[PDB]
Ligand binder design. Structure first.
Ligand SMILES: Cc1ncc(C[n+]2csc(CCOP(=O)(O)OP(=O)(O)O)c2C)c(N)n1
Ligand SMILES: Cc1ncc(C[n+]2csc(CCOP(=O)(O)OP(=O)(O)O)c2C)c(N)n1
Ligand SMILES: Cc1ncc(C[n+]2csc(CCOP(=O)(O)OP(=O)(O)O)c2C)c(N)n1
Ligand code: NA
Ligand code: NA
Ligand code: NA
Lengths: 527, 531, 527
């Protein structure tokens, strides 16, 4: 058996039968041995490749294989790889390397220190020391990617290694499983449940790891038992809670003073499956309101260690929430009132207000749509206006690395055969991942992409107000036709400027067997 | 005192002092405080994508020779530029890349848009990288960054600055920083010359192999004079990124093949290989055999000590390529050989197919294009065609990505053109390559940069079909890129584009494009040999 | 309140009141603010300091603070720090750095990239970006060091930072706790207990994490229930099991072929709290014997991912073993017979055979002595001849980094007020940590150090036989008088070459209230 034959038998064994790639000189020898039950998904650009892989991974929860070209290809993906770290995405990224004997002379398409290139992002990286060790290195890469705290891994393989004889002890590799402890001490539970039934006025703050661990329902049950309001942790990348449940209050602001002012009056903040906290704008003050204690539950030891306040429990979010939800006593307090009806959304301007666009999307879109959002200035509008209740209904770049949305939408859709993925991309964001449109065309991936085109980097105009920087060079991106870009990559696109035309183009796009792009002209509030 | 200056005011006074008045950027939360203090004599060039930004900066740098400033956003923006940065390393391009970082007190908690270990992110590419330990040290860190970028062996440097540092009071002793110069020894021992000239006048049949650093050091003329004096054939070192010699000079023989056995077979018969301004060697395809032909000794002259150390054969001299070549050219004795005959006429260029053969397209480009065009090439399968068919005779006439990192060509062309007020830049980009830097077309449109971009569209990754023959890998997934309209992409970014499939229509579209005051794209349908 | 005042209030809060150090220019400002309830332990050499800290940490289980000097001081400790990684030792190593404004100009005693210097060893390293962040960086360092998988952390602090005003939000830091899930799913248990009661002829292989988690008793109960033989995993750094219990069989050989041949006949290898496996000598072949499946239980996800065979469970070793021990059914199989008598130990030679010296040590030493071993060629002798029956009775350098033994003995003794620590150091090993004798003298630490002096690097003569390298330069270390070295550092020393004189010197040394060193002349088998 060759290193290639054993590696492929192993990827199949682990469910990595979808490969996202942009190929090169040094990866043809890997790709040549590829079996017929595997599918290769080509992207024209490594950032798109990797972000497509990321979206595919987020929807499935499964590890996902990426194959990139040398240093130039791996480098082009570093920006996207940041999002994978904070989204706890088990991408397994393999890179082709030049013939093993020639790397030292730095011949053309040598990756010099391949283990260093992708640090400090990836949890783990290896250039195996010999062809023999390539299969076990890939086994270790996969187990490592799926180990709490989940995350991306990188393996650089010299192209001549694939042809080498595989080591005898490789039937051994296939058989390997690695399990995580899926709970925490019985003693440590009774402390959590005492503190919860103790609290006079508690609040749940929920992060992406609740959505990742498919614990939306157990979060709901725990909010019902405590009659507790529920906020989403700041800078959210996923939606961990039904947005029209009585307990839902929205997203905490990502300012230190602003977040503590919002939670004023609560004696216990229980934060589940989020860092404490993913602040953004620098607005200094108190982490907590007076007379408040914070309990913190996370898969990520890094998150628990680096928090500046609180009592953390490092444990699986799924299990913990399931246990607490099924064992806390219903409280005395009255069940919470139903939420106000959705605020009314008028539009005065040449185009649509984001608030109105999202209300039109709510009315038109399937009950079980998946929304891949990368529309930086429209957050307040989205949350005040969307009705999400399925697991896995919202994805946003977890480190605000732009060029996630368009590609992640395509990848999410490929993973989601019976759920409609709708991309809501700004005109700025779309340019970082535009070539993923070609992949949707080629592989007939029926995504809907909505470009919110306000002619500007809106969120950066928002910041030049808070930072008193004023009229800075390069806030404006005028003169982009996204219909021309879509047709350039073989995707059918229409431009739209009124509610009636949008409702039409959207109803149409949801019916389509093919990728569709709608360019909406949107208005930016210049206060 | 009332002579109180901010870190921003001193940094800007310094960038002006050093000629870095052109800034390439894609902005973010953490860079607005830098950009806000930017003066009026400075120009910001926005790119929609950091790889495009940085490749534009690279092109601008290659034409001028000067250090060039880039400003990127945090970890996500810096990471998007790692691919492009590889080309900067092998092209010895003095890019100074600054990145915004989150407020200094908040980086440890890893708040949103924290770069965690900013110094590690860009290793091992950049020669040098710093996150200064305080606001006070930001000006000197940037001074050091610039001197370091321009120091043999030239290359890219990275500085991550927390955004709150710009507003901090600058250190007292900063008039001192401006006054700073750093000079490199621009020559080598008199004794060491007489060894070079003895070995050269010794050789019964010597050959010059020339690399990018001859073009970088503006030594094209002195290389010519040296080839005239030795009546020596001149080859370009393999996997060239620049053209260091006139391609229609008597001595010109073309590009050495980038295989070990193939290169040594080509130089068979020569007793002295003098390699100037190149690694030994930038091989690509693994074709094993002898590094040198029988009876041959290799002299190797390079600014780069790394290149001299890592070479697997040869006697190297680490010295400035410019000076060395100037000295040798002016002091070697005319040899007892006949001056070399003029080159044959250009081979004839017929095209059988639905489109143009690259050899015919390049012959049409030769006939249409000004004497002094600059060509930015990123067309991987068309190399033999280019060299057999182009008449390059001026410094700085050819750029190709120095680590074959694709997404250099389109953006580097735009940047090269911005730097090149009196010379037409012509991009020759494949349909594959163009997608890695497509957004640089927007920058050309916005800033009214009169580049001509020729997409050679053969519907495929041609050079990878070339490789699946040599590597016996066969029908591999993802060799084909069908269903892309570059005219639609150009018009999408506000560049005027036409598609063309015959010599008559190409000659027309090209004559027109060269007259334009605006970026123009010609999509040529080309033929790929499947037999 | 200054960064120094808050840092000290925090170290006290966390029980880090014992500080091991070698001081310099850049650490005086930290040390000056040290309170009276704290003790500083000076070592003359950073390797010794850090190995002393390691020994102190191993006996207590607690995180332990080290303070080193700049790049030259930190560099001198890199070797010792390797042992801390593989011994899962929560050392918190702080280093002084030059004044923050002057680091860039690389003035004298600048650490250039302090975060890079100690990678890839330490789990985690920071140079805080400002004085304000120094207390939280140290809080994060501590939590990180104690988080499964435990290990060393490094923090470089510019000396001017200690004097800076501390941030408002510092009462917050003190209050912080981080707990680990101290168990694993009820479902995942029933799989373990089925597989164990299933097996016709199972074997326990035990590693250092059993001793670290104070699970010696529960390992015993589980071996009694399965009437199972117990081996220690190869290259052991701790003793996880009573050596005179019926089930005890010794240490597995650290060769691939040799280990699988030893376990031939077993259908289930359960490995608890060790890597799979810590091989040394390259003796190639089959990882497992035919018809064998390996279950692997570890706190370390790194250990579980990189293993080349086995079904791994990443979980707390203490809990797991306690659960299994209390819930597996007693088996049909006959209770195991009492062990063979200790083999006879005669000596023909100018000195003692190691086997005879260890039998003299067995007879003379308290039931509950702690042995710190760094005697590379004497392993077979130690295990065939010692009666260890208590938690924390054996320590050996976990990456065979020499210069652990002498210092770890001193540190172990300082931590161990009512148990006698006995160091068994070779003449080779002793030179790497000799200066720790000074620390024992200064702080009146009643360690007993036995130098086994065979005039040679014995284990390297052992290897030049297996590697057919022959008479290699530098196998011999003649002309060293350890009595002169002891007295040089203010420790009482005697040299000894017969059983009768050893029994005398040893009886005397156990009576001492002061460090004592015995140099025994030993014989090396050149066969
Ligand atoms: C790779 C990368 N480059 C730059 C940024 C900075 N950035 C964040 S918000 C923003 C504006 C994006 O514009 P658009 O998508 O149009 O959103 P809008 O604010 O207009 O709703 C930019 C450029 C980033 N986060 N990531
Ligand atoms: C960033 C990057 N990804 C992948 C490669 C591998 N590669 C080498 S040539 C090539 C095909 C591009 O060819 P194209 O521009 O279509 O020109 P042609 O081969 O048709 O002449 C690719 C993808 C690379 N060099 N750089
Ligand atoms: C820091 C370090 N350097 C070198 C070695 C290699 N080494 C391992 S065993 C050994 C010899 C030590 O001999 P000694 O302690 O006298 O014991 P003996 O072999 O005679 O039992 C050496 C040099 C090592 N393990 N650690
Ligand atoms: Na916008
Ligand atoms: Na092509
Ligand atoms: Na010895």
């Amino acid at each position: 058996a060759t290193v290639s034959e054993v590696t492929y038998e192993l990827l199949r064994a682990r469910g990595l039968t979808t490969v996202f790639g942009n190929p090169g000189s040094n990866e043809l020898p890997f790709l040549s041995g590829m079996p017929d039950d595997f599918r290769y998904v080509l992207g024209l650009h490594e950032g798109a490749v990797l972000s497509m892989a990321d979206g595919y991974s987020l929807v499935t929860g499964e590890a996902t294989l990426v194959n990139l070209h040398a240093a130039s290809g791996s480098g082009n993906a570093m920006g996207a790889l940041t999002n994978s770290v904070y989204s706890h995405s088990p991408l397994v990224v393999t890179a082709g390397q030049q013939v093993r004997s020639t790397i030292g002379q730095e011949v053309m398409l040598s990756n010099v220190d391949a283990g260093t290139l992708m640090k400090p992002l990836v949890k783990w990286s290896s250039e195996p020391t010999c062809a023999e060790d390539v299969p076990r290195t890939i086994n270790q890469a996969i187990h490592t990617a799926l180990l709490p705290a989940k995350g991306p891994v990188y393996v650089s393989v010299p192209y001549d290694d694939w042809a080498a004889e595989a080591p005898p002890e490789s039937a051994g590799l296939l058989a390997r499983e690695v399990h995580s402890a899926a709970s925490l001490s019985g003693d440590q539970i009774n402390d959590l449940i005492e503190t919860l039934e103790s609290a006079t006025n508690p609040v749940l703050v929920l992060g992406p790891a609740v959505d990742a661990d498919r614990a939306n329902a157990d979060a709901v049950l725990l909010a019902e038992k405590l009659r507790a309001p529920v906020w989403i942790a700041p800078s959210p990348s996923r939606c961990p809670f039904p947005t029209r449940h009585p307990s839902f209050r929205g997203v905490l602001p990502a300012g230190v003073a602003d977040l503590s002012k919002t939670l004023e009056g609560h004696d216990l903040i229980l934060v589940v499956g989020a860092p404490v906290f993913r602040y953004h704008q620098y607005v200094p003050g108190n982490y907590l309101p007076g007379g408040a204690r914070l309990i913190h539950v996370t898969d990520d030891g890094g998150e628990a260690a680096r928090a500046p306040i609180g009592e953390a429990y490092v444990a699986p979010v799924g299990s913990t929430l399931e246990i607490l939800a099924n064992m806390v006593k219903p409280s005395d307090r009255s069940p919470l009132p139903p939420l106000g009806d959705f605020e009314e959304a008028v539009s005065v301007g040449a185009g649509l207000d984001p608030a109105q666009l999202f209300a039109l999307v709510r009315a038109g879109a399937p009950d079980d749509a998946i929304y891949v959002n990368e529309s930086t200035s429209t957050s307040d509008a989205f949350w005040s206006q969307m009705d999400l209740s399925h697991q896995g209904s919202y994805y946003f770049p977890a480190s605000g690395g732009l060029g996630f949305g368009l590609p992640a939408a395509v990848g999410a859709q490929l993973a989601s055969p019976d759920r409609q993925v709708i991309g809501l991309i700004g005109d700025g964001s779309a340019n970082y991942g535009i070539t993923a449109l070609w992949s949707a065309a080629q592989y007939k991936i029926p995504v809907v992409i909505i470009i919110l085109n306000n002619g500007t980097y809106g969120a950066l105009r928002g910041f030049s107000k808070i930072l008193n920087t004023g009229e800075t060079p390069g806030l404006d991106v005028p003169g982009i036709d996204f219909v021309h870009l879509a047709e350039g990559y073989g995707v059918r696109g229409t431009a739209v400027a009124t509610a009636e035309d949008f409702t039409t183009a959207f109803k149409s796009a949801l019916a389509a067997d093919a990728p569709t792009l709608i360019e909406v002209r949107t208005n930016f509030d210049e206060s």
